[PDB]
């Protein structure tokens, strides 16, 4: 079952998620229009490449963790 899509502005940045050199992962996340690699773990938690070792419950939580990590910086594409 894929998670639902989402779209919001979080700490001033547009984050989006949608069901769909890296894995073919069934969900995409974008931060200000740039795609962020994210991955789902067996227990249903999610991570992203900029917060890979800290599982969070949902792809939106991963997108928000990425905006926190970035501290305003643009993401570079993978």
């Amino acid at each position: 079952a894929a998670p639902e899509s989402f779209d919001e502005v979080y700490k001033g940045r547009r984050i989006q998620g949608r069901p769909a050199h890296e894995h073919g992962g069934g969900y995409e996340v974008f931060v200000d229009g740039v795609q962020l690699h994210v991955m789902r773990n067996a227990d249903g938690s999610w991570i992203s490449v900029v917060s890979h070792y800290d599982p969070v419950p949902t792809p939106r939580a991963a997108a928000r963790a990425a905006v926190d990590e970035l501290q305003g910086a643009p993401l570079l594409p993978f």
């Binding site: 992962g25 900029v50 910086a73 993978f78």
Partner: protein
Amino acid sequence: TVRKNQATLTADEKRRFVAAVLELKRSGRYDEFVRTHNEFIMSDTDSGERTGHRSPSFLPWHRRFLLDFEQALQSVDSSVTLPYWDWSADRTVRASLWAPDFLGGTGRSTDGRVMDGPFAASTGNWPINVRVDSRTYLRRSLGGSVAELPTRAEVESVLAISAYDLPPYNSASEGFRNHLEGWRGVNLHGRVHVWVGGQMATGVSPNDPVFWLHHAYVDKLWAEWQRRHPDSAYVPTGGTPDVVDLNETMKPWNTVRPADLLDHTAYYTFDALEHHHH
């Protein structure tokens, strides 16, 4: 080759290690290690092919990856070996690890920028090139995202686990490998990445030289586990889809198997490693 506790390096050993690391960066060789790592981080998945992470081969894969990096260092200075960081013992920001004559300390609070040591962006010697967060300076927030490093008591409870790994051989497994990797339990190796913060908390974590010292201690804990459990060995042992079996070769090298990497003494020893005993 003897791998030494970082806390015990002489001033001359620290100087030579740092100079060798900076030369690999200057010559362009360093960044290819960062890129390989991030490619496995992004490609290793719990429901598909998995080789460097979230799988039984997490330990032999990082052992060979660190061997490749140590051999690169030795091609620059043949006396240098990788030191290890025992984060269960040297657990505060005042560890000599984090001094300006070694790896430099924590990042300033506004942007996480490391401001001292040889790898500080202001030196001009440590550009962050292979990256996802577009900033190009080394960042850290020691203890920022997680309150404490693992303790010796926590490490001991993971070393006491008899089974190397267990089906389903991924981040949901019980068993030693996944408790050390950290996806189940009190979390050892992943928690340390979180605790350092900055690039170490990302798939491009080898951008921070502490990466190598962390993994050298994870590698030492595998050696300790084998001493504790001489009767227990790598699993699985053949015919497992998407997982590297004992005698299967491992990407990217393709010329090495977990079986060839179980015994570290063929490549290096440690300054101290308890032998088997009750």
